[PDB]
Amino acid sequence: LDKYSEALKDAQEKLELAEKKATDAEADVASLNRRIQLVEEELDRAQERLATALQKL
Amino acid sequence: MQALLGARAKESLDLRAHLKQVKKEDTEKENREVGDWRKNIDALSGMEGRKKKFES
Numbered sequence: 001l002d003k004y005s006e007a008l009k010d011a012q013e014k015l016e017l018a019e020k021k022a023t024d025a026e027a028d029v030a031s032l033n034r035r036i037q038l039v040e041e042e043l044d045r046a047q048e049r050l051a052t053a054l055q056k057l
Numbered sequence: 058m059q060a061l062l063g064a065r066a067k068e069s070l071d072l073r074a075h076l077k078q079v080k081k082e083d084t085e086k087e088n089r090e091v092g093d094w095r096k097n098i099d100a101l102s103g104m105e106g107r108k109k110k111f112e113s
Contacts, residue, residue, distance in 0.1 A: 012110030024104040
């Protein structure tokens with residue numbers, strides 16, 4: 001029991017840490033997707049503004 | 058024959074040059090020194106685990 005309880009506190013702690021890693025990694029998948037979309041949007045806008053600048057050119 | 062026309066041309070171009078000079082002075086004073094900044098973002102991506110603060 002102590003071995004399963006301890007194996008569990010460790011599987012569970014490793015899990016909280018892996019889940020945290022996933023949570024934080026996911027927080028970053030999301031922060032990266034926000035930056036990617038902000039930058040892709042600025043890029044598409046740079047390209048819209050470029051197409052416009054080129055049209056205005 | 059051409060005196061008045063020469064005078065008006067000189068005065069007009071001089072006025073344009075004066076306005077361009079006075080504005081270009083201001084544009085020239087400091088140019089890169091009024092440059093940009095950085096604003097770095099992390100988005101908590103460097104999270105390492107638990108923290109002393111009580112929010113978590």
